[PDB]
Design a protein around this ligand. Structure first.
Ligand SMILES: *[C@@H]1O[C@H](CO)[C@@H](O)[C@H](O)[C@H]1NC(C)=O
Ligand SMILES: *[C@@H]1O[C@H](CO)[C@@H](O)[C@H](O)[C@H]1NC(C)=O
Lengths: 316, 97, 49
Protein backbone atom coordinates (compact mmCIF):
# COMPACT_ATOMS: atom_id res chain seq x y z
CA UNK A 1 0.00 0.00 0.00
CA UNK A 2 2.97 2.26 0.77
CA UNK A 3 4.00 2.43 -2.90
CA UNK A 4 1.42 5.16 -3.53
CA UNK A 5 2.63 7.01 -0.43
CA UNK A 6 6.22 6.85 -1.64
CA UNK A 7 5.43 7.89 -5.21
CA UNK A 8 3.33 10.87 -4.11
CA UNK A 9 5.61 11.90 -1.24
CA UNK A 10 8.50 12.96 -3.49
CA UNK A 11 6.28 15.22 -5.64
CA UNK A 12 4.54 18.54 -5.04
CA UNK A 13 1.96 20.62 -6.91
CA UNK A 14 2.99 23.70 -8.86
CA UNK A 15 1.75 26.97 -10.35
CA UNK A 16 1.47 27.40 -14.12
CA UNK A 17 0.12 30.08 -16.45
CA UNK A 18 -3.60 29.93 -17.25
CA UNK A 19 -4.67 32.24 -20.08
CA UNK A 20 -8.34 32.47 -19.01
CA UNK A 21 -8.86 32.22 -15.25
CA UNK A 22 -12.67 32.32 -15.32
CA UNK A 23 -13.16 35.99 -16.26
CA UNK A 24 -11.25 36.36 -19.53
CA UNK A 25 -7.98 37.47 -17.90
CA UNK A 26 -4.72 35.56 -17.61
CA UNK A 27 -3.13 34.66 -14.28
CA UNK A 28 -0.75 32.25 -12.58
CA UNK A 29 -3.01 29.65 -11.06
CA UNK A 30 -2.74 26.50 -8.92
CA UNK A 31 -5.36 24.75 -11.09
CA UNK A 32 -3.91 25.12 -14.58
CA UNK A 33 -4.89 22.39 -17.05
CA UNK A 34 -2.22 20.40 -18.89
CA UNK A 35 -4.08 17.93 -21.10
CA UNK A 36 -7.49 16.38 -21.70
CA UNK A 37 -7.51 12.74 -22.80
CA UNK A 38 -10.53 11.13 -24.47
CA UNK A 39 -9.94 7.53 -25.53
CA UNK A 40 -12.92 5.84 -23.89
CA UNK A 41 -15.76 5.17 -26.31
CA UNK A 42 -17.85 5.25 -23.13
CA UNK A 43 -17.70 9.03 -23.45
CA UNK A 44 -15.52 9.44 -20.37
CA UNK A 45 -12.82 12.10 -20.45
CA UNK A 46 -9.84 12.41 -18.10
CA UNK A 47 -8.01 15.70 -17.55
CA UNK A 48 -4.61 16.59 -16.09
CA UNK A 49 -4.31 19.15 -13.38
CA UNK A 50 -1.52 20.98 -11.55
CA UNK A 51 -3.02 20.56 -8.08
CA UNK A 52 -3.00 17.18 -6.32
CA UNK A 53 -6.16 15.39 -5.17
CA UNK A 54 -6.22 12.86 -2.34
CA UNK A 55 -3.02 13.90 -0.54
CA UNK A 56 -2.66 16.22 2.44
CA UNK A 57 -0.12 19.01 2.69
CA UNK A 58 1.22 16.87 5.55
CA UNK A 59 1.73 14.09 2.94
CA UNK A 60 -0.77 11.70 4.56
CA UNK A 61 -3.35 9.97 2.39
CA UNK A 62 -6.65 11.75 2.93
CA UNK A 63 -9.54 11.26 0.53
CA UNK A 64 -11.28 14.50 1.57
CA UNK A 65 -8.53 16.98 0.70
CA UNK A 66 -6.77 18.56 -2.28
CA UNK A 67 -3.32 20.07 -1.79
CA UNK A 68 -2.26 22.97 -4.00
CA UNK A 69 0.46 25.63 -4.18
CA UNK A 70 0.37 29.38 -3.68
CA UNK A 71 3.59 31.28 -3.22
CA UNK A 72 6.05 28.83 -1.68
CA UNK A 73 3.76 27.04 0.79
CA UNK A 74 1.33 24.15 0.29
CA UNK A 75 -2.14 24.25 1.85
CA UNK A 76 -5.25 22.09 1.90
CA UNK A 77 -8.51 22.51 0.00
CA UNK A 78 -11.88 20.95 0.73
CA UNK A 79 -12.44 18.13 -1.76
CA UNK A 80 -16.18 18.81 -1.99
CA UNK A 81 -15.36 22.12 -3.72
CA UNK A 82 -14.02 20.45 -6.88
CA UNK A 83 -16.14 21.50 -9.87
CA UNK A 84 -15.78 20.43 -13.50
CA UNK A 85 -17.90 22.21 -16.09
CA UNK A 86 -18.70 22.61 -19.78
CA UNK A 87 -21.75 24.12 -21.44
CA UNK A 88 -23.53 22.27 -18.64
CA UNK A 89 -22.17 20.64 -15.49
CA UNK A 90 -20.17 17.47 -15.02
CA UNK A 91 -20.20 14.36 -12.83
CA UNK A 92 -16.86 13.31 -11.33
CA UNK A 93 -16.28 9.54 -11.42
CA UNK A 94 -12.84 9.45 -9.80
CA UNK A 95 -9.87 11.50 -8.63
CA UNK A 96 -6.27 10.68 -7.71
CA UNK A 97 -3.31 13.04 -7.70
CA UNK A 98 -3.06 15.02 -10.93
CA UNK A 99 -5.96 13.30 -12.69
CA UNK A 100 -9.75 13.71 -12.70
CA UNK A 101 -12.31 11.35 -14.22
CA UNK A 102 -15.47 13.19 -15.35
CA UNK A 103 -18.39 12.71 -17.73
CA UNK A 104 -19.72 15.93 -19.22
CA UNK A 105 -22.43 17.41 -21.45
CA UNK A 106 -21.40 18.60 -24.92
CA UNK A 107 -19.80 22.02 -24.89
CA UNK A 108 -17.15 24.26 -26.41
CA UNK A 109 -14.87 24.69 -23.39
CA UNK A 110 -13.94 23.00 -20.12
CA UNK A 111 -13.64 24.60 -16.69
CA UNK A 112 -12.28 23.25 -13.39
CA UNK A 113 -12.15 25.07 -10.07
CA UNK A 114 -11.42 24.69 -6.34
CA UNK A 115 -11.60 26.80 -3.17
CA UNK A 116 -8.40 27.95 -1.48
CA UNK A 117 -7.99 28.43 2.28
CA UNK A 118 -9.19 32.02 1.90
CA UNK A 119 -12.44 30.63 0.39
CA UNK A 120 -11.70 32.27 -2.95
CA UNK A 121 -12.46 30.54 -6.24
CA UNK A 122 -9.49 29.64 -8.44
CA UNK A 123 -10.48 28.38 -11.89
CA UNK A 124 -8.97 27.70 -15.30
CA UNK A 125 -10.89 27.59 -18.58
CA UNK A 126 -9.66 26.10 -21.86
CA UNK A 127 -11.19 25.56 -25.28
CA UNK A 128 -12.22 21.92 -25.74
CA UNK A 129 -14.61 20.58 -28.35
CA UNK A 130 -16.20 17.49 -26.71
CA UNK A 131 -18.98 16.20 -28.96
CA UNK A 132 -19.21 12.61 -27.68
CA UNK A 133 -20.97 9.82 -29.57
CA UNK A 134 -22.05 6.39 -28.29
CA UNK A 135 -21.20 3.04 -29.85
CA UNK A 136 -23.43 1.36 -32.40
CA UNK A 137 -25.73 2.60 -35.13
CA UNK A 138 -27.99 4.93 -33.11
CA UNK A 139 -27.17 8.28 -31.49
CA UNK A 140 -29.09 7.79 -28.26
CA UNK A 141 -28.85 9.82 -25.06
CA UNK A 142 -29.70 7.63 -22.05
CA UNK A 143 -29.39 3.86 -21.66
CA UNK A 144 -32.68 1.93 -21.85
CA UNK A 145 -34.25 -0.65 -19.59
CA UNK A 146 -34.39 -3.04 -22.57
CA UNK A 147 -31.73 -3.32 -25.24
CA UNK A 148 -28.58 -4.99 -26.52
CA UNK A 149 -25.00 -5.28 -25.26
CA UNK A 150 -22.12 -3.92 -27.35
CA UNK A 151 -18.41 -3.74 -26.37
CA UNK A 152 -17.14 -0.49 -24.84
CA UNK A 153 -13.88 1.02 -23.53
CA UNK A 154 -13.69 3.05 -20.31
CA UNK A 155 -11.20 4.23 -17.67
CA UNK A 156 -11.28 1.76 -14.78
CA UNK A 157 -10.60 3.25 -11.34
CA UNK A 158 -8.16 0.54 -10.22
CA UNK A 159 -5.41 3.16 -9.64
CA UNK A 160 -2.98 0.32 -8.85
CA UNK A 161 -1.16 -1.21 -11.85
CA UNK A 162 -0.47 0.80 -15.00
CA UNK A 163 2.06 0.88 -17.82
CA UNK A 164 1.88 4.60 -18.68
CA UNK A 165 3.84 7.26 -16.81
CA UNK A 166 4.73 10.95 -16.86
CA UNK A 167 8.11 12.64 -16.53
CA UNK A 168 9.13 14.44 -13.34
CA UNK A 169 12.06 16.74 -12.57
CA UNK A 170 13.45 19.20 -10.04
CA UNK A 171 11.82 22.65 -10.00
CA UNK A 172 13.94 25.59 -11.16
CA UNK A 173 15.00 28.65 -9.18
CA UNK A 174 11.93 30.50 -7.92
CA UNK A 175 12.20 34.31 -8.06
CA UNK A 176 10.64 36.23 -5.18
CA UNK A 177 10.88 40.02 -4.98
CA UNK A 178 9.43 40.23 -1.47
CA UNK A 179 12.59 38.72 0.05
CA UNK A 180 14.31 42.13 -0.14
CA UNK A 181 13.98 44.50 2.82
CA UNK A 182 15.29 48.07 2.62
CA UNK A 183 16.70 50.14 5.48
CA UNK A 184 18.46 53.50 5.56
CA UNK A 185 21.12 52.54 3.02
CA UNK A 186 20.88 48.88 4.07
CA UNK A 187 19.48 45.94 2.09
CA UNK A 188 18.12 43.28 4.44
CA UNK A 189 17.38 39.75 3.22
CA UNK A 190 14.72 38.01 5.30
CA UNK A 191 15.13 34.28 4.73
CA UNK A 192 11.93 32.56 5.83
CA UNK A 193 13.43 29.11 6.39
CA UNK A 194 14.68 28.27 2.92
CA UNK A 195 17.97 28.73 1.09
CA UNK A 196 18.12 31.77 -1.20
CA UNK A 197 20.30 32.15 -4.27
CA UNK A 198 21.77 35.61 -4.50
CA UNK A 199 23.30 38.11 -6.93
CA UNK A 200 23.87 41.85 -6.45
CA UNK A 201 25.97 44.17 -8.62
CA UNK A 202 27.74 46.97 -6.75
CA UNK A 203 28.96 45.04 -3.72
CA UNK A 204 28.76 41.32 -2.99
CA UNK A 205 26.80 38.58 -4.72
CA UNK A 206 26.77 35.00 -5.93
CA UNK A 207 26.14 33.21 -2.63
CA UNK A 208 23.74 30.40 -1.88
CA UNK A 209 22.74 31.39 1.64
CA UNK A 210 21.82 28.12 3.34
CA UNK A 211 19.19 29.63 5.64
CA UNK A 212 21.09 32.79 6.62
CA UNK A 213 19.78 36.33 6.90
CA UNK A 214 22.02 39.09 5.56
CA UNK A 215 22.26 42.84 5.13
CA UNK A 216 23.96 44.83 2.37
CA UNK A 217 25.12 48.30 3.40
CA UNK A 218 26.42 49.30 -0.06
CA UNK A 219 24.01 48.29 -2.83
CA UNK A 220 20.31 49.06 -3.31
CA UNK A 221 17.15 46.98 -3.29
CA UNK A 222 16.83 47.66 -7.04
CA UNK A 223 20.42 46.52 -7.68
CA UNK A 224 20.09 42.84 -6.77
CA UNK A 225 18.27 39.59 -7.53
CA UNK A 226 17.11 36.72 -5.31
CA UNK A 227 15.48 33.34 -5.88
CA UNK A 228 14.55 30.43 -3.61
CA UNK A 229 16.81 27.57 -4.68
CA UNK A 230 15.90 24.52 -2.57
CA UNK A 231 14.81 21.38 -4.43
CA UNK A 232 13.75 18.44 -2.26
CA UNK A 233 10.73 17.41 -4.36
CA UNK A 234 9.83 16.62 -7.96
CA UNK A 235 7.19 18.18 -10.20
CA UNK A 236 5.78 17.47 -13.65
CA UNK A 237 7.75 18.74 -16.65
CA UNK A 238 5.21 21.20 -17.96
CA UNK A 239 6.01 23.45 -20.94
CA UNK A 240 4.85 26.46 -18.88
CA UNK A 241 7.70 26.34 -16.34
CA UNK A 242 11.43 26.24 -17.22
CA UNK A 243 14.03 23.65 -16.27
CA UNK A 244 17.40 23.89 -14.55
CA UNK A 245 19.74 21.86 -16.76
CA UNK A 246 20.28 20.92 -20.40
CA UNK A 247 21.24 17.29 -19.62
CA UNK A 248 17.76 17.23 -18.04
CA UNK A 249 17.66 14.10 -15.95
CA UNK A 250 14.10 12.92 -15.45
CA UNK A 251 12.02 10.73 -13.18
CA UNK A 252 8.88 8.75 -13.89
CA UNK A 253 5.58 8.32 -12.06
CA UNK A 254 2.86 5.86 -13.07
CA UNK A 255 -0.48 7.50 -13.86
CA UNK A 256 -3.82 5.99 -12.75
CA UNK A 257 -7.07 4.94 -14.47
CA UNK A 258 -6.06 2.60 -17.32
CA UNK A 259 -8.19 1.76 -20.34
CA UNK A 260 -10.27 -1.41 -20.18
CA UNK A 261 -12.99 -3.36 -21.98
CA UNK A 262 -16.55 -3.07 -20.68
CA UNK A 263 -20.02 -3.68 -22.09
CA UNK A 264 -22.36 -0.72 -22.60
CA UNK A 265 -26.05 -1.21 -23.33
CA UNK A 266 -27.57 0.25 -26.50
CA UNK A 267 -31.18 0.51 -27.71
CA UNK A 268 -32.74 -1.16 -30.73
CA UNK A 269 -34.84 0.73 -33.27
CA UNK A 270 -38.44 -0.38 -33.74
CA UNK A 271 -38.90 -2.32 -36.94
CA UNK A 272 -40.29 -0.27 -39.85
CA UNK A 273 -43.53 -0.65 -41.82
CA UNK A 274 -43.02 -2.76 -44.95
CA UNK A 275 -45.37 -2.45 -47.94
CA UNK A 276 -44.86 -5.03 -50.69
CA UNK A 277 -44.93 -3.40 -54.10
CA UNK A 278 -43.99 -5.13 -57.34
CA UNK A 279 -40.22 -5.67 -57.44
CA UNK A 280 -39.85 -3.04 -54.70
CA UNK A 281 -40.93 -2.24 -51.14
CA UNK A 282 -41.69 0.93 -49.19
CA UNK A 283 -40.39 1.49 -45.66
CA UNK A 284 -41.86 3.87 -43.10
CA UNK A 285 -39.06 4.70 -40.66
CA UNK A 286 -39.89 6.32 -37.31
CA UNK A 287 -36.75 7.11 -35.28
CA UNK A 288 -36.49 8.28 -31.68
CA UNK A 289 -32.99 9.71 -32.36
CA UNK A 290 -30.57 9.73 -35.32
CA UNK A 291 -30.44 6.21 -36.71
CA UNK A 292 -28.36 4.65 -39.49
CA UNK A 293 -30.20 2.89 -42.33
CA UNK A 294 -28.56 1.07 -45.23
CA UNK A 295 -29.54 -1.41 -47.92
CA UNK A 296 -27.87 -3.45 -50.66
CA UNK A 297 -28.98 -5.94 -53.29
CA UNK A 298 -27.55 -9.46 -53.23
CA UNK A 299 -26.21 -9.54 -56.76
CA UNK A 300 -23.22 -9.00 -59.03
CA UNK A 301 -23.58 -5.21 -58.70
CA UNK A 302 -24.80 -4.54 -55.14
CA UNK A 303 -26.58 -1.18 -55.76
CA UNK A 304 -26.39 0.02 -52.15
CA UNK A 305 -27.18 3.19 -50.18
CA UNK A 306 -26.52 4.57 -46.69
CA UNK A 307 -27.99 7.43 -44.68
CA UNK A 308 -28.52 8.90 -41.20
CA UNK A 309 -32.27 9.20 -40.58
CA UNK A 310 -33.31 11.86 -38.06
CA UNK A 311 -37.04 12.33 -38.78
CA UNK A 312 -39.86 10.10 -39.98
CA UNK A 313 -39.41 9.44 -43.70
CA UNK A 314 -40.44 7.01 -46.43
CA UNK A 315 -37.99 5.08 -48.60
CA UNK A 316 -38.73 2.93 -51.65
CA UNK B 1 1.77 12.94 -45.78
CA UNK B 2 0.55 15.36 -43.09
CA UNK B 3 -3.08 15.34 -42.01
CA UNK B 4 -4.09 12.28 -44.07
CA UNK B 5 -4.11 8.53 -43.44
CA UNK B 6 -0.69 7.17 -42.60
CA UNK B 7 0.85 10.44 -41.46
CA UNK B 8 2.67 8.31 -38.88
CA UNK B 9 3.61 4.73 -39.75
CA UNK B 10 5.02 1.71 -37.94
CA UNK B 11 5.84 -1.75 -39.29
CA UNK B 12 4.25 -3.59 -36.36
CA UNK B 13 2.72 -2.70 -33.02
CA UNK B 14 5.94 -3.42 -31.11
CA UNK B 15 8.21 -2.07 -33.86
CA UNK B 16 10.48 0.85 -33.01
CA UNK B 17 10.85 2.80 -36.27
CA UNK B 18 7.96 5.31 -36.18
CA UNK B 19 8.05 7.24 -39.40
CA UNK B 20 6.30 10.56 -38.82
CA UNK B 21 5.39 13.43 -41.17
CA UNK B 22 3.14 15.75 -39.16
CA UNK B 23 4.44 19.19 -40.26
CA UNK B 24 5.49 20.17 -36.74
CA UNK B 25 6.90 23.69 -36.48
CA UNK B 26 8.08 25.79 -33.52
CA UNK B 27 7.47 29.50 -32.96
CA UNK B 28 9.09 32.32 -31.04
CA UNK B 29 7.77 32.80 -27.48
CA UNK B 30 5.63 35.85 -26.84
CA UNK B 31 7.60 38.51 -24.94
CA UNK B 32 7.33 38.27 -21.17
CA UNK B 33 6.18 34.71 -20.48
CA UNK B 34 7.45 31.13 -20.38
CA UNK B 35 5.81 28.87 -22.95
CA UNK B 36 6.69 27.01 -26.12
CA UNK B 37 4.31 27.78 -29.00
CA UNK B 38 4.17 25.57 -32.07
CA UNK B 39 1.89 24.62 -34.94
CA UNK B 40 1.24 21.19 -36.41
CA UNK B 41 -1.27 19.55 -38.72
CA UNK B 42 -3.84 17.56 -36.70
CA UNK B 43 -3.97 13.78 -36.77
CA UNK B 44 -4.62 11.93 -40.00
CA UNK B 45 -5.99 8.88 -38.24
CA UNK B 46 -8.65 11.12 -36.71
CA UNK B 47 -9.33 12.64 -40.13
CA UNK B 48 -9.70 9.16 -41.62
CA UNK B 49 -12.07 8.13 -38.82
CA UNK B 50 -14.61 10.53 -40.39
CA UNK B 51 -13.84 10.66 -44.12
CA UNK B 52 -13.11 6.95 -44.57
CA UNK B 53 -16.18 6.18 -46.65
CA UNK B 54 -18.34 3.09 -46.91
CA UNK B 55 -16.95 -0.24 -45.79
CA UNK B 56 -16.81 -3.45 -47.77
CA UNK B 57 -19.30 -4.72 -45.19
CA UNK B 58 -22.01 -2.44 -46.59
CA UNK B 59 -21.35 -3.02 -50.31
CA UNK B 60 -20.31 -6.59 -51.07
CA UNK B 61 -21.51 -8.54 -54.12
CA UNK B 62 -23.39 -11.82 -53.81
CA UNK B 63 -24.28 -11.11 -50.19
CA UNK B 64 -20.83 -11.71 -48.74
CA UNK B 65 -20.62 -11.11 -44.99
CA UNK B 66 -17.24 -9.58 -44.24
CA UNK B 67 -16.08 -10.73 -40.84
CA UNK B 68 -13.76 -10.38 -37.88
CA UNK B 69 -10.09 -11.01 -36.97
CA UNK B 70 -9.45 -13.75 -39.55
CA UNK B 71 -10.44 -11.56 -42.49
CA UNK B 72 -12.99 -13.67 -44.36
CA UNK B 73 -16.01 -13.31 -46.64
CA UNK B 74 -18.68 -15.63 -45.26
CA UNK B 75 -21.39 -17.16 -47.43
CA UNK B 76 -20.80 -15.62 -50.86
CA UNK B 77 -22.86 -17.21 -53.63
CA UNK B 78 -20.67 -17.80 -56.70
CA UNK B 79 -19.56 -20.77 -58.74
CA UNK B 80 -20.00 -24.52 -58.52
CA UNK B 81 -18.32 -27.13 -56.33
CA UNK B 82 -17.13 -30.28 -58.12
CA UNK B 83 -17.27 -33.29 -55.82
CA UNK B 84 -16.09 -36.87 -56.37
CA UNK B 85 -17.12 -39.72 -54.08
CA UNK B 86 -15.95 -43.33 -53.67
CA UNK B 87 -18.84 -45.27 -52.17
CA UNK B 88 -18.33 -48.64 -50.46
CA UNK B 89 -19.99 -51.77 -51.74
CA UNK B 90 -22.28 -52.06 -48.70
CA UNK B 91 -24.03 -48.73 -49.29
CA UNK B 92 -26.21 -50.16 -52.09
CA UNK B 93 -29.11 -52.62 -52.28
CA UNK B 94 -29.35 -55.67 -54.53
CA UNK B 95 -31.97 -55.50 -57.27
CA UNK B 96 -33.31 -58.89 -56.16
CA UNK B 97 -33.80 -57.35 -52.68
CA UNK C 1 -2.99 8.77 -33.73
CA UNK C 2 0.17 10.45 -32.55
CA UNK C 3 1.34 12.26 -29.42
CA UNK C 4 3.43 15.43 -29.41
CA UNK C 5 6.05 15.46 -26.66
CA UNK C 6 6.96 18.93 -25.40
CA UNK C 7 9.45 19.29 -22.52
CA UNK C 8 10.04 22.27 -20.28
CA UNK C 9 11.99 24.98 -22.11
CA UNK C 10 15.61 25.66 -21.21
CA UNK C 11 16.30 29.31 -20.32
CA UNK C 12 19.87 30.54 -19.84
CA UNK C 13 20.14 33.88 -18.03
CA UNK C 14 23.11 35.86 -19.39
CA UNK C 15 24.16 33.10 -21.74
CA UNK C 16 23.53 31.28 -24.99
CA UNK C 17 22.75 27.75 -26.14
CA UNK C 18 23.25 25.50 -29.17
CA UNK C 19 20.79 23.26 -30.99
CA UNK C 20 21.51 19.53 -30.83
CA UNK C 21 20.17 17.01 -33.34
CA UNK C 22 18.41 13.92 -32.02
CA UNK C 23 17.14 10.55 -33.23
CA UNK C 24 13.47 11.21 -32.50
CA UNK C 25 10.76 11.28 -35.20
CA UNK C 26 9.81 14.72 -36.56
CA UNK C 27 12.17 16.31 -34.03
CA UNK C 28 12.54 20.10 -34.03
CA UNK C 29 14.72 22.40 -31.92
CA UNK C 30 15.33 26.15 -32.02
CA UNK C 31 17.11 28.84 -30.01
CA UNK C 32 15.72 32.37 -29.71
CA UNK C 33 18.06 35.27 -29.20
CA UNK C 34 16.80 37.78 -26.64
CA UNK C 35 14.14 36.97 -24.03
CA UNK C 36 12.93 38.20 -20.64
CA UNK C 37 10.71 35.46 -19.24
CA UNK C 38 9.11 37.02 -16.10
CA UNK C 39 8.53 33.61 -14.52
CA UNK C 40 6.26 34.60 -11.62
CA UNK C 41 6.71 37.18 -8.88
CA UNK C 42 9.86 38.28 -10.66
CA UNK C 43 11.73 38.36 -13.94
CA UNK C 44 13.70 35.09 -13.48
CA UNK C 45 16.74 36.74 -15.08
CA UNK C 46 18.89 39.59 -13.78
CA UNK C 47 19.98 40.12 -17.35
CA UNK C 48 18.25 42.62 -19.60
CA UNK C 49 18.94 41.33 -23.12
C1 LIG D 1 25.18 38.00 -11.52
O1 LIG D 1 24.71 39.14 -12.24
C2 LIG D 1 25.64 39.64 -13.22
C3 LIG D 1 25.03 40.88 -13.82
O2 LIG D 1 24.03 41.43 -12.97
C4 LIG D 1 25.92 38.56 -14.26
O3 LIG D 1 26.88 39.04 -15.19
C5 LIG D 1 26.43 37.30 -13.57
O4 LIG D 1 26.58 36.26 -14.53
C6 LIG D 1 25.45 36.85 -12.49
N1 LIG D 1 25.96 35.69 -11.79
C7 LIG D 1 25.20 34.64 -11.47
C8 LIG D 1 25.90 33.52 -10.75
O5 LIG D 1 24.01 34.59 -11.74
C1 LIG E 1 -10.06 -5.48 -25.22
O1 LIG E 1 -10.16 -6.68 -25.98
C2 LIG E 1 -9.32 -6.70 -27.15
C3 LIG E 1 -9.63 -7.97 -27.89
O2 LIG E 1 -10.45 -7.73 -29.02
C4 LIG E 1 -7.85 -6.59 -26.73
O3 LIG E 1 -7.03 -6.56 -27.89
C5 LIG E 1 -7.63 -5.34 -25.90
O4 LIG E 1 -6.30 -5.32 -25.40
C6 LIG E 1 -8.62 -5.29 -24.73
N1 LIG E 1 -8.43 -4.11 -23.89
C7 LIG E 1 -8.60 -2.81 -24.21
C8 LIG E 1 -9.03 -2.47 -25.61
O5 LIG E 1 -8.40 -1.93 -23.38
Amino acid sequence: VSQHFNVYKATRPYIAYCADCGAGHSCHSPVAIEAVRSEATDGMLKIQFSAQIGIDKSDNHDYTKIRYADGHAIENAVRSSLKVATSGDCFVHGTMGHFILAKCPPGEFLQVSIQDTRNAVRACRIQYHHDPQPVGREKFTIRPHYGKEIPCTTYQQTTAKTVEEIDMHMPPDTPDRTLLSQQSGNVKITVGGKKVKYNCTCGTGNVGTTNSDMTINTCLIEQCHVSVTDHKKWQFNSPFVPRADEPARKGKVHIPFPLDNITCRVPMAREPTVIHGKREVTLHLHPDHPTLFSYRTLGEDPQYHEEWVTAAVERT
Amino acid sequence: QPGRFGDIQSRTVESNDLYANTALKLARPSPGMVHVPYTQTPSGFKYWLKEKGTALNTKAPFGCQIKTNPVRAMNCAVGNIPVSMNLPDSAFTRIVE
Amino acid sequence: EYKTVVPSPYVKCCGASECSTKEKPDYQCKVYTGVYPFMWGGAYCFCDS
